[PDB]
Amino acid sequence: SGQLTAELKRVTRLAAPMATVTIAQYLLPVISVMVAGHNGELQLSGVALATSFTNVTGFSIMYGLVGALETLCGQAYGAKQYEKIGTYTYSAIASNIPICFIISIIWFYIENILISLGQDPDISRIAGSYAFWLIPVLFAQAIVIPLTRFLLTQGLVLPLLYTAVTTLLFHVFVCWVFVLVFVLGSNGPAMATSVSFWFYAVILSCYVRFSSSCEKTRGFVSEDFVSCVKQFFQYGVPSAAMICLEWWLFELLILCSGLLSNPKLETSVLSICLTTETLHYVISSGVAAAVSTRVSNNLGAGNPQVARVSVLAGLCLWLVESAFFSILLFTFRNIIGYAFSNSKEVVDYVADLSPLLCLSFILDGFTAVLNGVARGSGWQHIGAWNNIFSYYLVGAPVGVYLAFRHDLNGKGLWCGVVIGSTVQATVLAIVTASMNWKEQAEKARKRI
Ligand SMILES: CCCCCCCC/C=C\CCCCCCCC(=O)OC[C@H](O)CO
């Protein structure tokens, strides 16, 4: 009772700003698409195919790698190794640059890749140009996302929130400018995203460089620069997979929906369900980041007990958040489809799909908090191999079978999600109960 209250206050102190941070982070591509309008059926499929490509190969890796910074910097703030936080962060930037180069090399070929996959050459040309103008966003994120974990792993969530909201409003302005006054064309939104993310880079760099809050953590020691890069890849390769295997699968999901009977019907309804799923996953990502932060810090501080109650408090947040969003959807299960489409067949499809998505809500929340525990403790490789096991070896076969042979074209798809997500939580539950907190604190000591 006395221990839960203590960490519940500090986990929530990180949970709310990072939740709003995540809201402002996913509401940025939505702003790109909305400002552009429907310039054309060709440009619609070209930009969608471009941003889907870019997210599958390059962006998921970049966003997933600094799970290494969540464990390394997160445990380093607990042991008060304040020089190593800056060393880990700037070694992450240095590591991200050659990876950005590789991804850009691959992006130069996107047109020839898509035409070889059997797509329209003109759609592949639009996608090639749009993806080519998203290259500055790669190196910009190589600066921003390590800085993101730099502020998060210490508890400086408010500078992250202020700079994120500022970046969102900036992106609204220059998307308006680029699309409406500069009339660039289809790639206007892409270049506006490059400008916005570099603005995010200079404001985060400005705060970290000129603020008293980051006086103890800013700066890197030259000697350890070779060691930290090694350690970052140690915990970067699994974490990146733990993100890629999810985004890739969701991409596979939408393509599978395009091969069913009535493809527009099932694809529109499935896009509704997964937009809803991610819209809850942003708050679920906020609670996950908070749990990862506090557990990593308590493991670094040599206190496994407070790390346990850290997990408990995050599960409490999961309970109230997931019950809230689940019951809230179920109240408007028969109307919420009207917000997405005007066809009556679609609204009833998502209406029948609503309880299964409620299960997806509570499952995604549970697996996100426990995956945050995995990132904060340092066993991300468990999460990666469980991702392949839960979604590719179980969920995808049961999802494909139920959807195609059982005349459950759209619902069967989502059933493969739920069962897969369920298996995911089950193993994530076992490994978080059997795990020794005594050793994780001692193991965190030698990591840092
Ligand atoms: C039933 C189907 C299951 C499918 C497979 C799902 C993944 C779980 C597999 C093994 C976890 C075993 C528990 C391992 C706990 C130790 C984690 C750890 O920290 O290992 C670090 C290691 O010493 C390096 O330095």
Side-chain angles (χ1 to χ4, degrees):
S1 183
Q3 269 281 45
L4 272 93
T5 296
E7 282 308 283
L8 182 67
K9 152 163 155 145
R10 323 226 329 185
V11 153
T12 302
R13 282 205 80 96
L14 306 169
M18 309 294 317
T20 301
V21 156
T22 321
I23 298 164
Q25 280 312 287
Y26 167 66
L27 272 185
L28 190 125
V30 190
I31 279 167
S32 294
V33 164
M34 253 182 156
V35 163
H38 55 84
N39 38 9
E41 207 201 298
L42 193 70
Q43 282 84 54
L44 252 53
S45 292
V47 170
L49 181 82
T51 196
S52 171
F53 202 115
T54 53
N55 284 264
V56 159
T57 167
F59 281 144
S60 36
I61 290 173
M62 284 276 95
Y63 173 71
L65 281 176
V66 279
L69 254 51
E70 247 173 310
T71 165
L72 293 173
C73 291
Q75 295 166 189
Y77 197 82
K80 273 131 183 284
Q81 220 86 339
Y82 290 152
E83 299 195 320
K84 254 189 192 296
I85 296 186
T87 317
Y88 280 138
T89 284
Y90 313 160
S91 73
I93 299 175
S95 312
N96 288 323
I97 288 314
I99 298 167
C100 285
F101 275 124
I102 299 175
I103 296 163
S104 298
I105 294 175
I106 278 154
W107 284 9
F108 290 151
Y109 283 75
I110 279 190
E111 183 179 344
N112 302 145
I113 295 195
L114 296 163
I115 296 185
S116 70
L117 301 173
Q119 301 298 99
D120 175 14
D122 296 6
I123 304 183
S124 306
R125 171 134 274 171
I126 283 176
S129 198
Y130 194 86
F132 169 80
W133 284 110
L134 288 176
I135 283 158
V137 202
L138 278 176
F139 303 91
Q141 278 169 67
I143 279 186
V144 174
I145 323 180
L147 271 43
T148 309
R149 293 312 104 97
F150 172 84
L151 295 169
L152 167 63
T153 43
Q154 320 168 199
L156 298 195
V157 294
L158 298 174
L160 262 171
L161 180 124
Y162 304 172
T163 52
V165 169
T166 291
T167 287
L168 188 76
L169 305 148
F170 186 89
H171 176 253
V172 177
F173 179 84
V174 307
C175 262
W176 273 347
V177 161
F178 278 48
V179 164
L180 306 180
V181 313
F182 278 149
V183 285
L184 298 312
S186 167
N187 322 320
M191 289 167 296
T193 300
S194 295
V195 173
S196 315
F197 269 86
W198 277 105
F199 169 83
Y200 206 1
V202 300
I203 61 173
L204 274 194
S205 303
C206 266
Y207 188 85
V208 176
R209 167 75 179 93
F210 292 118
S211 76
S212 152
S213 316
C214 310
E215 190 144 49
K216 54 172 108 194
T217 40
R218 142 209 52 205
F220 87 110
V221 200
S222 319
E223 170 96 43
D224 315 77
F225 172 64
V226 175
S227 289
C228 297
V229 184
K230 181 46 182 146
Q231 271 195 323
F232 157 85
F233 276 103
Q234 275 195 24
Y235 314 97
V237 181
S239 314
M242 225 194 326
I243 303 293
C244 289
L245 299 161
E246 300 198 309
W247 293 29
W248 294 353
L249 183 124
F250 144 79
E251 225 68 48
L252 293 160
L253 203 52
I254 206 63
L255 184 140
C256 196
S257 182
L259 322 163
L260 307 157
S261 317
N262 214 156
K264 318 158 234 184
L265 181 54
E266 321 286 322
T267 312
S268 303
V269 162
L270 209 76
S271 288
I272 290 171
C273 295
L274 290 145
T275 286
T276 302
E277 200 191 311
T278 56
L279 250 184
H280 148 274
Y281 202 77
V282 297
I283 290 95
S284 168
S285 302
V287 50
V291 179
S292 195
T293 307
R294 281 274 80 200
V295 153
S296 58
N297 292 337
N298 276 126
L299 284 184
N303 203 329
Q305 299 82 353
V306 185
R308 256 198 325 278
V309 306
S310 269
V311 186
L312 266 45
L315 256 74
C316 290
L317 279 184
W318 155 68
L319 270 189
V320 85
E321 71 95 342
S322 148
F324 170 86
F325 284 110
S326 306
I327 309 294
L328 180 57
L329 163 73
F330 199 85
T331 314
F332 306 96
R333 61 181 208 275
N334 282 314
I335 317 97
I336 217 62
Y338 284 109
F340 273 101
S341 179
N342 277 323
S343 149
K344 210 261 181 280
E345 181 165 30
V346 175
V347 194
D348 310 351
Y349 204 1
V350 164
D352 182 51
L353 260 300
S354 310
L356 265 297
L357 189 142
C358 303
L359 274 165
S360 310
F361 271 1
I362 86 157
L363 287 169
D364 291 331
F366 192 56
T367 61
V369 165
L370 291 192
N371 274 320
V373 152
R375 288 195 307 273
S377 284
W379 41 280
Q380 292 95 314
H381 50 304
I382 283 76
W385 289 104
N386 160 46
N387 260 342
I388 309 185
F389 162 53
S390 319
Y391 287 104
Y392 296 88
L393 300 170
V394 185
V398 192
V400 159
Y401 168 82
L402 286 167
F404 277 96
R405 172 172 218 99
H406 267 245
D407 260 40
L408 248 65
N409 322 72
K411 304 115 182 166
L413 293 189
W414 208 255
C415 289
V417 155
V418 153
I419 279 144
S421 192
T422 307
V423 155
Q424 181 187 31
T426 315
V427 158
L428 271 166
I430 296 183
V431 299
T432 200
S434 294
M435 149 186 61
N436 267 125
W437 288 98
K438 144 199 157 33
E439 78 84 39
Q440 279 296 337
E442 156 188 349
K443 205 129 208 281
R445 244 289 172 192
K446 277 271 260 146
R447 273 189 253 289
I448 298 320

